[PDB]
Amino acid sequence: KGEDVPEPSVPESFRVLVKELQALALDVQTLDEKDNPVDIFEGLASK
Amino acid sequence: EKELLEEMKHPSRARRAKARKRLEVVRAFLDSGNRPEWMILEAVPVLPPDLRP
Amino acid sequence: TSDPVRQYLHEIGQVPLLTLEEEVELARKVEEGMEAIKKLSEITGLDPDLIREVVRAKILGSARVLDPKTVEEIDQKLKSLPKEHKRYLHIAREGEAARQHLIEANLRLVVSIAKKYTGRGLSFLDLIQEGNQGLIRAVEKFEYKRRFKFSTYATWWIRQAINRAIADQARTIRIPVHMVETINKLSRTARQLQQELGREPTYEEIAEAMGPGWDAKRVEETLKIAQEPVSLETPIGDEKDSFYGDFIPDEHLPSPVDAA
DNA sequence: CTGCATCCGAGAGCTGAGGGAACCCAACCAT
DNA sequence: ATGGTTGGGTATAATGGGAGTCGTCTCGGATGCAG
């Protein structure tokens, strides 16, 4: 369309890594500056 | 932790090293808030199917 | 320490075998314990299976984890019953103990039968466990009044359990038992036809050799559904760097061109 | 009681390219 | 209302498995020896 490319996002391989670490019963959680959880899965994996 | 801290006063160097090694794990659990019994599994997680296609 | 087969063999070998007197004695005990269970069920008016479970729980003891409260309430709900018609409960306890002994003593026949079923998709220990299940069923159903030896009735149940487990669990994609039998019959027929012809038979020859209701197309479908999936981790090439799944493209998610 | 001393086991060894075996019988949900 | 699927059954006697692998190097627990 002639514009410039946007800013990138989280790669899918890191999501695969997080899921594979959860399968080993390890809780991997991404946090912001205030130590609060940051959901990298866009609310598609939260009950 | 109190017992191991008391043990860490022995003149023996090997005893002190063993107490320190146990204290490392004890203090890691105490600091993290993890429960030791969580090292035994009751429910086994199952990977999403698209990653085991 | 390791090699669980040796550990299991050692634990089974620690239990001595049985003579005719002991085997017939235990079988008679089991039968009278079941009859006593039914008599006590009639006396109290309750369901027989639940009282059977209370007897089993009391024999197995606290060591084995229906809850302690319920079983305790019914346990004292039975102690209240007066003499002469109480023996039944003791006979039931004895019979359940006899059942446990009988199974423990006949565990070795399960191994003897199961040792000739290796290489069909189930490990040795799984076959042994399924044979143990069949042995428990045979113990429950055994009738000593017919004067037959226990192993004669036990072998059939052990074989049935092993065969059913093999048909049920050997494949990643589950295939029904009748279809599994059809596949086995097809393979055996093809092997006999190859032995006779001196070469791999064609599908029409196999269809003719199966009987009425079989054409080459049906044989083709049966061979198609009998194919087992391959591993995504199958190594390609000599070096340990290339897997099969590395050569499979994703056809589900839209491509950048498609999204645009 | 300590210490050191072999002893055992566990975790490694460059990138890129190309490489592919029983049978039968009867009831019961699904379509 | 039909096929496909599933649970149950067989009664001389049977009673402890089987493939395998010896041509590598370095470092941190540990049992064993002495004092």
Swiss-Prot record, chain A:
Domain of life: Bacteria
Functional description taken from the UniProt entry: DNA-dependent RNA polymerase catalyzes the transcription of DNA into RNA using the four ribonucleoside triphosphates as substrates.
Similarity-based family: Belongs to the RNA polymerase beta chain family.
Subunit structure comment from the entry: The RNAP catalytic core consists of 2 alpha, 1 beta, 1 beta' and 1 omega subunit. When a sigma factor is associated with the core the holoenzyme is formed, which can initiate transcription.
UniProt-recorded name of the protein: DNA-directed RNA polymerase subunit beta
Organism of derivation: Thermus thermophilus (strain ATCC 27634 / DSM 579 / HB8)
Gene it is expressed from: rpoB
UniProtKB/Swiss-Prot annotation, chain B:
Domain of life: Bacteria
Subunit structure as annotated in this protein's UniProt entry: The RNAP catalytic core consists of 2 alpha, 1 beta, 1 beta' and 1 omega subunit. When a sigma factor is associated with the core the holoenzyme is formed, which can initiate transcription.
Family indicated by similarity: Belongs to the RNA polymerase beta' chain family.
Function in brief: DNA-dependent RNA polymerase catalyzes the transcription of DNA into RNA using the four ribonucleoside triphosphates as substrates.
Name of the protein in question: DNA-directed RNA polymerase subunit beta'
From Swiss-Prot, chain C:
Region of interest (Sigma-70 factor domain-2), residue spans: 102-172
Compartment annotation: Cytoplasm
A GO cellular-component term linked to this record: cytoplasm
Short motif Interaction with polymerase core subunit RpoC, span: 126-129
Region (Sigma-70 factor domain-1): 2-37
GO BP field: DNA-templated transcription initiation
Region: Sigma-70 factor domain-3, residue numbers: 181-259
GO molecular function, one term: DNA binding
Alphabetized UniProt keyword annotations: Cytoplasm, DNA-binding, Sigma factor, Transcription, Transcription regulation
UniProt keyword annotation of DNA-binding present: yes
Family that this chain belongs to: Belongs to the sigma-70 factor family. RpoD/SigA subfamily.
Subunit description: Interacts transiently with the RNA polymerase catalytic core formed by RpoA, RpoB, RpoC and RpoZ (2 alpha, 1 beta, 1 beta' and 1 omega subunit) to form the RNA polymerase holoenzyme that can initiate transcription.
Domain comment as written in the entry: Contains 4 domains, connected by flexible linkers. In the active conformation, the domains are in an extended conformation, each making extensive interactions with the RNA polymerase catalytic core.
Function noted in UniProt: Sigma factors are initiation factors that promote the attachment of RNA polymerase to specific initiation sites and are then released. This sigma factor is the primary sigma factor during exponential growth.
Protein name, as recorded: RNA polymerase sigma factor SigA
UniProt organism field: Thermus thermophilus (strain ATCC BAA-163 / DSM 7039 / HB27)
Gene coding for it: sigA
